[PDB]
DNA sequence: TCGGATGTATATATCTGACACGTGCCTGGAGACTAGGGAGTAATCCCCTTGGCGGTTAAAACGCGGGGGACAGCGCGTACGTGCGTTTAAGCGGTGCTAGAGCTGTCTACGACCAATTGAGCGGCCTCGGCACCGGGATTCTCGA
DNA sequence: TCGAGAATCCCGGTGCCGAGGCCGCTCAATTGGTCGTAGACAGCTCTAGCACCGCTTAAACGCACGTACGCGCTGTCCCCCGCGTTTTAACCGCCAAGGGGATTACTCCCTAGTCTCCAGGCACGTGTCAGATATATACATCCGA
């Protein structure tokens, strides 16, 4: 019979692997396209240095990681295992970001 | 037992010492061979400082080891 | 070819590293990180000292303001050790001439 | 009328960071009308002490991994594992740093 | 120009996995995309304001550092 | 036979009454004594101005009220009405305090 | 005069009134100790900073300006007491 | 001879002191030199902000059939507006109080 | 035996209040709060302008630095209205 | 589904302490003039950004079977809300007293500024060793039975 | 409880590119002397912070009782997870073209500094009315039958 793992082991393996390493997790070109589209709304015919895009990517990734950690804590507090949008909303409300 | 000790200038000196010997005799011997007074020398072995009262046997040093010497003027 | 000179804390950081760890290198990214750290700490301490001097309607920045700002900024053990090091350095410098 | 040999101000204090550069930066930084003659020595000593502490911790962390060079991962590991240094850099993110390897206890497999 | 869709689902899954999450529901992705859009909007607006005051046409990496620092989110290692 | 209110009405009455007012809640003299005792550990034989004590009381009360609001939100999030210490711990942890 | 056992001066009804203003309806029996500890920590930090500010000026009396400056240094500035 | 003096605020048509702002900028250790147009801009901005806050507070006070303004009215005016609350999101006002809200769950059935 | 002089912003705030609401008073604590608010905003704007001037290797602060600092600090509608008011004040002053 | 009892909102007299306003005056702001450097403007160099084309391969997208987790319902017993009689100390009004905050002279040591100059620090080259990468075997886990 | 597959780690050999060191030089930190004033020390004045005593009454305490909610247990149903197959666009390498950043030289005008003069803002004193208390009354609301 084909060999299958129980649901849950591969998630832990991925957790270990992805928090042991220090590489970026989002492809560069889609992020650059998104940054250009967002910045277009403020001033027309702009130009970007590559290091600026790299810094933006690093800051965004760090912010998202921290937010996800706090969301996981909030989800665990309510006797659950899966994160839900209400957890993100509660974390952002308590942190003072959302009004 | 034979140990080589290096300086910040790459200057390497061979030194014959016994495992039971403690480091005060080692600094006295480098006074004998160099004359640097025994206060401005600091000896680092693989990133750890050496306590003066403790002996070489407790550090588990091996033959043909590589000890590093740095000089702190401290003069002022 | 004319190139403008740039100032950085590279050589001093390397000297400190070679004083602490006799055999250990460093890469460029770590150098930039350490430079940014030094600049940030310097700016914070200088700003706090300037504000403290302005509070007491005085027009001079002395070592007293630096000591008070250091005590206000850093945590406990770090503040104690930094104060000891600073006072030792100042006494050493004053004694010699 | 024979000028004596020049001796740097940092040499007299027995320091490594430049006293004169700090003095000039304080003078030109728009901090106060006048600057005393003792503040740069204090500031240089404090900066040197902090740099030495950070470098020692980072070098140890690098040595545990069997490497002879310091990369931002080692600096991040050294900073985040010390409570006081973590308190100091509370709102600072380091490029190419990563995160500390922790896992919540409940998520671990049963039995 | 729906380039917000370029942040694909496995990327969010990888970010959450690094964050330490074991199970993910099916509606997290929209919230993540909205949050990312808002954050990028704020930071880019500040950087563009700095560049406009500088009387230039290309944003550098240094005014991005200024914009990040203004929000109490200091960044190290980019020539700060 | 004596008239009694069901559990919960007086709580809402007090909530409305104390949200409609602005005066301080903690007594003055015990707070002043606590402030003096706390300040003793740093320098002996100190003296205080009244306005400093008033400012300290105001700031402490505002901080406590905000913390209680966040704790109530945390308690509500988990299908509960009663607040517990773990809610306070979670709120303080998320806020970014050690 | 040396003072001792003054943290208990913050009585249970005071905490109840604070919670009522905060919008709480039901309170467990273990909240009071946590509230006392949190208040003690906050007061310790603020008073330490204020005492340092006072000590710098070669004075012996803590003024409202010192408390205002100490509060501002921690990003919780206060209005209505000068400065 | 010499002509009669006219304040710079009168020339700018403001109610805030231009000269005091100029002196504070010069003596505040902000820059080596100060231009001739900054005080006017600063005074205009400060006057506009003060006028907005005062108008909102006065409306709030007139709601409560009172003739004078107390800190409660200032707190109510500030916390009821979006941008003003965002500007003062980390400021506490003495003798202010709180906003009368109650979560919908705790209400009786 | 008179004390020294203490500067404040009470006169101008009262003038503005009488300009907006012609039949309303104000108490002492409200005046203190307004004074603190004015000083705090002034300090923020001045500090931001000084930093901005420092960044571009410049040795003076003009109306441009104030305008950019106002744009950076305040939210949208307030920033737009304040910019319009400051521009109007500057052109009116330079006209005479 | 009604009806009694309690808490809260509403109308009126009254008396007090803080708000609004008038005066003197003195210190800070306004008018007039110089002199010098910071900044605006034009011209040149070339580096770094943008755009396009081919391939190749890893990552993204889609479908399917199923086991484990979220959620509703039910029973119980204990902690917490409410009311009452008792005890405790906070609050208010005076009276004493002096430590220390605040202001004024003076006089000296300390820092800014300028001219000569020389050794520290930065830019360019290069050279080789530490680290990255590929192939292989030993080890350590997980999931039926 | 026990054993067959997968995933990971330790080892050895090979190549490359960037980090550590050497020269040359130019601009900034020293050195020496002078001059002006910021602040440190001494003296005096007066206010507010600490201490004490008495009295009143409002708030904190302890206790009894009932009931509602926090918590554990059980069953269902469905929706993420792991795995296989197909598709696509990211990435790397290379090649052109040009706009805008970065210096450099010159010149006009904008601001700092000084002197003289005078009026606006601050401290002091005073009258009076806006509102806080007290009293009484009318209405909204909650729990039981």
Observed structural traits:
heterononamer, C: 97 residues, mainly alpha, Histone, subunit A, 2 strands, E: 80 residues, 3 helices, elongated, DNA-binding
Task: Describe, in plain words, how this protein is organized in 3D.
Chain G: The nucleosome is a histone octamer containing two molecules each of H2A, H2B, H3 and H4 assembled in one H3-H4 heterotetramer and two H2A-H2B heterodimers. The octamer wraps approximately 147 bp of DNA. Chain G: Residues 8-73 form the TATA box binding protein associated factor (TAF) histone-like fold domain. The complex is a heterononamer, with 2 copies of chain A, 1 copy of chain B (76 residues), 2 copies of chain C, 2 copies of chain D and 2 copies of chain E. Chain A is mainly α and 99 residues long. Chain A is built from 4 helices and 2 strands; from the N terminus they run ααβαβα. The longest helix of chain A has 28 residues, at 50-77. Chain C is mainly α and 97 residues long. Chain C has a single domain, classed as Orthogonal Bundle (Histone, subunit A). Helices cover 72% and strands 4% of the residues of chain C. Chain C has 4 helices and 2 strands; from the N terminus they run H-E-H-E-H-H. Chain C has helices at 10-20, 28-55, 63-73, 76-95, and strands at 25-26, 60-61. In chain D, helix 2 crosses helix 3 (39-63) and helix 3 (39-63) crosses helix 4 (72-80). Helix content of chain D is 50%, strand content 6%. Chain D has 111 residues and is mainly alpha-helical. Chain D starts with 8 loop residues before the first helix and ends in a 17-residue tail after the last strand. Chain D contains 5 helices and 3 strands, in the order ααβαβααβ. Chain D has helices at residues 9-13, 19-28, 39-63, 72-80, 83-88, and strands at residues 34-35, 69-70, 92-94. Chain E has one domain: Histone, subunit A (Orthogonal Bundle). Chain E has helices at 9-19, 28-53, 62-70; strands at 23-24, 58-59, 74-76. The radius of gyration of chain E is 16 Å and the shape is elongated. Chain E is mainly alpha-helical. Chains C and D meet through helix 1, strand 1, helix 2, strand 2 and helix 3 of C and helix 1, helix 2, strand 1, helix 3 and strand 2 of D. Strand 3 of chain D pairs parallel with strand 3 of chain E. Chain A binds a DNA duplex (145 and 145 nucleotides) through residues 1-11, 13, 27-30, 47-50, 80-82.
């Amino acid at each position: 019979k084909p060999h299958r793992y129980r649901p849950g082991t591969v998630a832990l393996r991925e957790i270990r692997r992805y928090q042991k390493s220090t590489e970026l997790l989002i492809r560069k070109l889609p992020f650059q396209r998104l940054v250009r589209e967002i910045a277009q709304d403020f001033k027309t015919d702009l130009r970007f240095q590559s290091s600026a895009v790299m810094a933006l990517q690093e800051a965004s990734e760090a912010y998202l990681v921290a937010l996800f950690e706090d969301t996981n804590l909030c989800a665990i507090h309510a006797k659950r295992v899966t994160i839900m949008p209400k957890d993100i909303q509660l974390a952002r409300r308590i942190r003072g970001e959302r009004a | 037992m034979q140990i080589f000790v290096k300086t910040l200038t790459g200057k390497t000196i061979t030194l014959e010492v016994e495992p039971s010997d403690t480091i005060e005799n080692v600094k006295a011997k480098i006074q004998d061979k160099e004359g640097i007074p025994p206060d401005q020398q600091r000896l680092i072995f693989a990133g750890k400082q050496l306590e003066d009262g403790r002996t070489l046997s407790d550090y588990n040093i091996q033959k043909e080891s590589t000890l590093h010497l740095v000089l702190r003027l401290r003069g002022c | 070819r004319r190139k403008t000179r740039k100032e950085s804390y590279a050589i001093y950081v390397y000297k400190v590293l070679k004083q602490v760890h006799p055999d250990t290198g460093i890469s460029s990214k770590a150098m930039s990180i350490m430079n940014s750290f030094v600049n940030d700490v310097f700016e914070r301490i200088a700003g706090e000292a300037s504000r403290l001097a302005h509070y007491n309607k005085r027009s001079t920045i002395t070592s007293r303001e630096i000591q008070t700002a250091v005590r206000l900024l850093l945590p406990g053990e770090l503040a104690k050790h930094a104060v000891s090091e600073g006072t030792k350095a100042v006494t050493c410098y004053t004694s010699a001439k | 009328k024979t000028r004596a040999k020049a001796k740097t101000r940092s040499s007299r204090a027995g320091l490594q960071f430049p006293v004169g550069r700090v003095h000039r930066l304080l003078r030109k930084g728009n901090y106060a009308e006048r600057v005393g003659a003792g503040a740069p020595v204090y500031l240089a000593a404090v900066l040197e002490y902090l740099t030495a502490e950070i470098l020692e911790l980072a070098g140890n962390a690098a040595r545990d991994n069997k490497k002879t060079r310091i990369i931002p991962r080692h600096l991040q590991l050294a900073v985040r594992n010390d409570e006081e240094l973590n308190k100091l850099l509370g709102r600072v993110t380091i490029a190419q740093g990563g995160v500390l390897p922790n896992i919540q206890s409940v998520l671990l497999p049963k039995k | 120009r729906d380039n917000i869709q370029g942040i694909t689902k496995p990327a969010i899954r990888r970010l959450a996995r690094r964050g330490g999450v074991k199970r993910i529901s099916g509606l997290i992705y929209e919230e993540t995309r909205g949050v990312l859009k808002v954050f990028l909007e704020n930071v880019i607006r500040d950087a563009v304001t700095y560049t406009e005051h500088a009387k230039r046409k290309t944003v550098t990496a240094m005014d991005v550092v200024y914009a990040l620092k203004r929000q109490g989110r200091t960044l190290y290692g980019f020539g700060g």
